[PDB]
Design a protein around this ligand. Structure first.
Ligand code: IUM
Ligand code: IUM
Lengths: 81, 80
């Protein structure tokens, strides 16, 4: 499956990075900041497994991180302020 | 591997329990959207597993786990 090929994972990582920076652009609670930190840990893990050639684990890590991050984004409508 | 049938089946059973429990506490409207999305992605995982698309199923379940775990991290029993 092309979902876990190198180029797709790389682009997933780039997109996650932008999303994390986006969430860092607003005030988050300490608990939400802990979610961000966990997402960053899983980003780092995704990169590790990609670099070791384990695309399935890498893909799992990035999608988990995307879930963590997308939840935060959904809890903060951009028109919330 | 993390995406073998046995592992995905266990992931799906575990997530169902987590979601049923999250489903039945007081949630904000925004959190309800997240729970709905997690349930939808669990259903997608179930579907792709039936089709034998293990990578796709695995992506769906891990995404749903991330959505769900984020909520769990915002609802610590002992907040501190
Ligand atoms: O396959 U490249 O950066
Ligand atoms: O999806 U959970 O621990």
């Amino acid at each position: 499956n092309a979902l876990d090929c190198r180029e797709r994972i790389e682009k997933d990582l780039e997109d996650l990075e932008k999303e994390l920076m986006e969430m860092k652009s607003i005030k988050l609670s300490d608990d939400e900041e802990a979610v961000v930190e966990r997402a960053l840990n899983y980003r780092d893990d995704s990169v590790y497994y990609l670099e070791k050639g384990d695309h399935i684990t890498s893909f799992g890590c990035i999608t988990y991180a995307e879930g963590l991050t997308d939840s935060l984004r959904m809890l903060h409508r951009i028109i919330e302020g």
